[model samples]
Target chain A: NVQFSNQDGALGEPANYTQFQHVLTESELQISDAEGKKGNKEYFALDGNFTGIVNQYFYVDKKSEALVFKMKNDHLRNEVRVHKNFRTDLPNKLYTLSAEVEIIDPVASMKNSNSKQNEITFLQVHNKGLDNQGTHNVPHPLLRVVWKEDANSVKGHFWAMVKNNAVICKGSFGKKNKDKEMCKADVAYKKYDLGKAPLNKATAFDITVGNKQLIIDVDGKRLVEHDIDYWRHLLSYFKAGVYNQFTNGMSEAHFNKLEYKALE
Target chain B: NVQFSNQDGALGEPANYTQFQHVLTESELQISDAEGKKGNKEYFALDGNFTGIVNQYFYVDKKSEALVFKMKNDHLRNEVRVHKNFRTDLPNKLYTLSAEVEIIDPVASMKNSNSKQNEITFLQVHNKGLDNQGTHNVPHPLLRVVWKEDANSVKGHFWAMVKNNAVICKGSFGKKNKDKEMCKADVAYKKYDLGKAPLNKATAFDITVGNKQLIIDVDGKRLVEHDIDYWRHLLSYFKAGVYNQFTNGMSEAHFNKLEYKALE
Candidate 1:
């Protein structure tokens, strides 16, 4: 069994708590308010209900049983993620995280100079650490399942982005480039394309972190197998929700059939 | 303890057999004759003695206790390597192979067009397979400790060359590029420089293959650590000897203090 701690505060009485009883407890909803403040409020509920001014950000569809997450172009973030409080040592323990999700709308970035305006992350294996140490302790996503929409067409591409800490520059970087070594981190992507995104259609995605290996599966097909030996010294946990990378238009996704397991 | 099979026939009486009793048994010596024919004859002995026409190719120095291997420009190969007959499954078992060696005379390739003329391999983890399957079964060195000399300078560079099979092209390559896909194999090098070579000076070199990791140590310093998860499905064995990649000048190396161990 795994455990999660609520990062946000709960509001009002817990309504439809039985629906997410297996995972969600009385917790605060995390969302950006109209003024761009991040905090827990009574705007979201465990039963897939949304209230107050943030009602348009998230809610549940009773007919589809889907938990919907929506974010406006002006909002920096509007996610409903649950952080697995337990950290697992890699290359020794195996963990599997899976979910079925569909992207209903993807927003473009408000900044025209942003090359990643059409990209958004839906799932990740986030590093464990405190958020106050600036970039040193800032939570980094070791692995991200990202969706990128093509500029002219509605069709988009899907892929996994993985981190390779082993490629970091070590030893001396001299005085002029001291910070360069500290900020050097290798990222690998595009090698494992998850294929075209099927907008509005539910797609299955699975990420399994095993002994020295990371396997990604999309729509029941194995898409990528990566060597994670560089991550042996680090600890991480699973996170699933709509992480909008844009601030121009609106972005939304529906998630259901989520599951997490620790394998032998 | 690891076992090795003599790939060549033993010649004459086992003179000085006690010197290499721990490793070398009554086995044939593999060498190319004056006419470039490969076979075992009464030209080499276990006691580090060489006889007949092959005497200049290999022998032992009684004073230094070093096994010397030499190859002329006309000779294709003049190695005295012992094959570890037992294959070890990777990422499950750990093994260490080490030796102290010195390059006395480096050779240059006879072919001027050969870009790799100055390079030679001294140790390797060779793949296990049959010899008759053309490229399919051809023994490939998964890891090689190579020494490459720079033109116009006596100073040389040392590094480890590692093969990454995971990057092989899969799926379809079409009719025009069928062979291209079959020959696609990723190779990584230069990232782990073992530093400058101390010519004519004995240097310690160690290679350890562990659970999903491959480490290379030179002169007691760890030089490289690579993820070997892609090699999980393959079997390999250790090999140590002077493998000359050039054919223009003479190449020779002295090896001593060789050791092999299987770690828990």
Candidate 2:
């Protein structure tokens, strides 16, 4: 069974195995808010499977058989994601996550109003911190699959943002001991271009993670094969959904396929 | 010209074109200590080149033409290194350091008495901190060519210990808000085996460093070709000589060939 989240917190499993659930509530609240929009508007589905209407934020087109995720410019912090319940300590097992997706909105007229506004994340390998503190201490996402649209065109590109551990200077031992200094913990981000992402066209992407290796592929073409030994001590899981980054217009994407496999 | 350091500290350079200087002093001190042991023992050389006696800790064989680095069991935290005067901001240029070395002592009867007492560093690509603090804030050696002897046998292996930046947990928000945490800067060490080092047998090793990449070769065999973008922000230089880690008995190694190159 898969777990799903949206403006409304965690929704348990669907009542029937063949049908999925959806919510259409209205409220001025972010996804992390304690309470969801005040009213339960309605629920809808198609082909006996979970289909449209995950609030005004997400839905599926019945005729097109596409899982559509949508958010308005006013809804800045909204998201619709499928969280795979499976998690593993990387060194102990290997897993693969794959999906076919297409950006439908963020049309030619849209423009980035903030540093991160023109981009949206569609896939991620999220980590859970195992330190004494808690999940909050966990490092950033191990990997993020992002689509960045150009300022004035619908044309965009796909990028893989990877995070690695890095050492940073904290401060000096003081003026009296000017020659010595200390170090603080930090992370560094590395970016790789996956390829051009044409608007409204389906592109297949896949990610494989194991002990000390990470391989990413787009449209069956291998893009990156990297060593990630620095992340050996963390536990991680996969997440797929529409994470909006634009605030000047609506953001939307369609997903035609999503799959996961555990390998020995 | 190259800079050299021993128990007596940095020695300027040889007095004449052909004769190099040597130190033979005694003291209960470390390489980082400020003062040298009292007395100017003597200066010796072979074929008009720097030869034997570097304060009883290092010397060269007059007959074999080999530079020998030696330290006793009681002499912990001691080193005799030749520092390359040249430095570079890695992204702007490339450099290569190579040498032919042999472990001549720490014979079959020797045993590791402490956690790191069986290993000794013979070469390194050291970095100088460019951050606000000073050189002390610099990250650990970008690379260390280490030789580890077995617990009881003279046979051992060579390893390249490379340091990379890593993100670490500083502390979390209190119990009232335990979900969030802060990050601190730190370093992670990654090691690669560079094949065997038989007693008294010479092994050739080389290292190349530049923007976003590091390559190491042992006996002409490429052992590691790694992406090191994490180190792109700092300036680095090369150093070669013996940095002892063992304290159970005497440690010694002979250098037959040492070379450096700056690449465009």
Candidate 3:
């Protein structure tokens, strides 16, 4: 089958095709951008639709042998099209779409610290596995990471040696709980994305921040200064296997005790 | 005609009938300074035995009505002693033998923008419930009241004013698999600790750094920084009638998504 995927029943070769449908080609697609960059499919695939930008629709046309992304503006509807063909010639390869949140990695200052502020490198969030009593049937806690500006020299180091570490989690997203768990590192990595997670040129998913590993979501603001370390210490509880259902942060209600110490 | 509701045992008048004991009178206790301090009553009542120091014990006695605690470092052993007719006449006065590990109220510094950590203060631990995971059960969670050095503040303002409010967590007890609930904060007061748990101040207990309000064992090294606010957040699931075999600090873990932000 000389598989071609694109616009249906139009001038396209396919007899009847659905837009945005996945295309299967025996070989890779030969496409280029306005900049003349060849095979830059990742950008085109997410340009208008997956990136949440409106005024565009993406689909597949069999006769065209590619995934066709069409755009529509005030003057035109689906007039401009970009294509990404399903490669077939490459015998054994599969396309996958999945993203797992990263975990937090401990650092030197955090691991061996004596301060009031906790080196919060990892956190987990619960996205509704709660029962009638606020109990979790199967815990689905989210994770987060925090980047200490003064302590984040390693990102600069690794980025320098390898260049791809530039999406530094700066202060642009520091609100409160929005991004806290989403940006932390975990002591033990539960999800590895099967090597799909972003990695350096080393091809190894393992990255370390100081004495600790730096796998986390740090683009948010859940890492507090006063009692964060106390909660951070509780992370060790994750070693047990199952999850525990409970509230978040410190408050007067539903409480038992707290201990705080200032670190140097 | 004797009113024993919330009243203290009669001094020297309870010839034989007695349920609890009053280690401190009224003059021996002071918040900031333990100077001119005598026998350590808080340490004594915890032992539950007045015979001799258990080598890790001490006794708190009355010094002209004010409680004065004295460290009983015996010739070869450390012990706490309880008088036979201590709280004999003091009825209805809820008392517990609580210990203070090390008190630190740092000086003011402009760099510390967190309002919670602004002034000098001391927080007492009160346990409410225990959330256990198999062998591990830490305090459910609780609050911290930041008090200014001044005593003229309003009751709520100075009493349970959870400013740089720390968290209330419990007995990490350091022993493996011995995890139990650990957190304490009173709920009845305009602030914490008025008529919450109903434990008498006359009864003694132990608090060493991280682990406070221990009913069974003590673990010093397992003390981790706990976020009480997160605990409160998790409790909402229960308050809303949601239940789960969830993790402690899971909700606060969501805050981890917000890296490097102030916790409210």
Q: Scored by CA lDDT, what does every candidate get?
A: 0.54, 0.54, 0.20
In model 3, which runs have C-alpha deviations exceeding 4 angstroms? A1-187, A190-264, B1-59, B62-120, B125-142, B145-158, B163-229, B232-264
Estimate TM-scores for all models. 0.42, 0.41, 0.22
In order of TM-score, best first, we have: 1, 2, 3
* Predicted model with the maximum TM-score: 1
Cα RMSD (Å) per model? 16.5, 12.8, 23.0
lDDT of 2 by residue, B104-201 (tens): 76543146456444677777876654432333234367788888765246347788887754222222222333223222122356778777777657
**lDDT digits (tens) for residues A1-264 of candidate 3:** 112233243333211233222221111121212122322222222332322211113232334333222211111111112122111112142221111122113232234334333322211221221112222111222222222212233231111011111111224212321233332433212322122212221111111111111222112221121111111211111100011111111100000111111111
Residue-wise C-alpha lDDT for candidate 1, range B197-259, written one tens digit per residue: 786688998888767777888999988877765454344666665665654556677777666
Can you write out model 1's per-residue Cα lDDT over A1-264, one digit (the tens) per residue?
A: 111122243322123424443434322245555345333222344443423312445555555767666665432455544444333334456888778888774533333424454577777776553111111122346687877765346347776777644222223312322244333433222235678877668899988876777788898998888776544434466666566665456667777656666766
Which window of 10 residues has the lowest lDDT sum in candidate 2 chain A?
A21-30
How does model 1 score on DockQ? Answer: 0.02
Best by DockQ: 2
Tell me the DockQ of each model, to 2 decimals.
0.02, 0.03, 0.02
Per-residue lDDT for B1-264 in model 3, tens only?
101111232222211213213332111111111121232222322333333221101111222221121111111111122212111011232122232222111122112333332322222332322111111222331323222323333221222322121222223322321232212223211232211111112211222212121111112222223223222211110000001111111000000000011111
Give the B-chain TM-score of model 1: 0.69
